[PDB]
């Protein structure tokens, strides 16, 4: 995350963080429930084999809530394309399940047709991670989050060297310099109505961070939340 | 009565009818007798921030 703020204790219990041959984050995911990660398609090829960590707020501290699960099954959207990052979207099943408790929540899933009308609609949503804090910087620490602005799709197009499909949303800033950034892909992208969390977005992919005319893109959740549920049985 | 007009009164989702609007919410919440609230049925329901440290 370039800019924003360190997130508060128990301001962002839905982030997980997919750990690779290492305990290093590589990208981020979302807690759905106490078996099931939403995460980027993108983010399976990115390492080998993986872990699955939820509770962290402070890579370099044991805190005592922390705790890491093993994947059990990974889903896999079917049309998923490394080329423009279409259909950027998978759920983990994990082998045992999350206790939740302090920093540890799942986000939760929408209807589709209020979401579409009542959250993609709204000024803002949040996005969260522990990735780089500039472009060409390291990871964070500590976990982050931003306030990013929804941007219209003839904006989102326009902005963008690559295609921009209706699996995808622009949120962001077009000059000021806040945007996700890499080790934040698969993360959340969550939009609040009257002080509850809503999954709307997947951080999917952008041209650098936080460049200018540039925007961050995010898979559009709302055209995956049947997919979701069948995922997720 | 709209959705569009205070989300219907709505905690969380709303949805038009041919005259009335209907509340509903996520799982993890019962609508509450009003119609209208969402009351958590657990201690750590989606989509809210862990405040409350029990
Ligand atoms: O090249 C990179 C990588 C990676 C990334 O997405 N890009 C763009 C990939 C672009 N596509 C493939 C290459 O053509 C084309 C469209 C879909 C993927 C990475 C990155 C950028 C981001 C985000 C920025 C804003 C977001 Cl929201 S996510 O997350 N990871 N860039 C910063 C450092 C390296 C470079
Ligand atoms: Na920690
Ligand atoms: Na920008």
């Known amino acids: 995350i370039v800019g924003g703020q360190e997130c508060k204790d128990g301001e962002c219990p839905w982030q997980a963080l997919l750990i690779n041959e290492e305990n290093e984050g590589f990208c981020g995911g979302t807690i759905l429930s106490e078996?099931?990660?939403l995460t980027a398609a993108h983010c399976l090829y990115q390492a080998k084999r993986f872990k699955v960590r939820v509770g962290d707020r402070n890579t370099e501290q044991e805190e005592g809530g922390e705790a890491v699960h093993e994947v059990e099954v990974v889903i896999k959207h079917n049309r998923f394309t490394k080329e423009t990052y279409d259909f950027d979207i998978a759920v983990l099943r994990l082998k045992t399940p999350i206790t939740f408790r302090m920093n540890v929540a799942p986000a939760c899933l929408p209807e589709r047709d209020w979401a579409e009308?009542?959250?993609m609609t709204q000024?803002?949503?949040?996005?969260?991670?522990?990735?780089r804090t500039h472009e060409k910087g390291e990871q964070?620490?500590?976990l982050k989050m931003l306030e990013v602005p929804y941007v219209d799709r003839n904006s989102c197009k326009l902005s963008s060297s690559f295609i921009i499909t209706q699996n995808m949303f622009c949120a962001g800033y077009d000059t000021k310099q806040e945007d996700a950034c890499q080790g934040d892909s698969g993360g959340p992208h969550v939009t609040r109505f009257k002080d509850t969390?809503?999954?709307?977005?997947?951080?999917?992919?952008?041209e650098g961070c936080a460049r200018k005319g540039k925007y961050g893109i995010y898979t559009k959740v709302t055209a995956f939340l049947k997919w979701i549920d069948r995922s997720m049985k | 009565k709209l959705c569009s007009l205070?989300?219907?009164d709505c905690?969380?989702?709303?949805?038009?009818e041919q005259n009335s609007v209907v509340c509903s919410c996520a799982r993890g919440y019962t609508l509450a007798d009003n119609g209208k609230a969402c009351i958590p049925t657990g201690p750590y329901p989606c989509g809210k921030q862990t405040?409350?440290?029990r």
Do not use: A, M, P
């Not at chain 1, 969390?197 to 952008?206: E, H, K, R």
């Not at chain 2, 905690?11 to 038009?16: A, G, K, L, V």
């Open chain 1, 35 to 37: 078996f099931y990660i």
């Open chain 1, 117 to 119: 009308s009542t959250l």
């Open chain 1, 123 to 131: 000024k803002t949503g949040i996005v969260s991670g522990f990735g």
């Open chain 1, 140 to 142: 964070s620490t500590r």
């Open chain 1, 197 to 206: 969390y809503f999954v709307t977005g997947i951080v999917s992919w952008g």
């Open chain 2, 6 to 8: 205070d989300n219907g």
């Open chain 2, 11 to 16: 905690d969380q989702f709303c949805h038009e």
């Open chain 2, 51 to 53: 405040l409350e440290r």
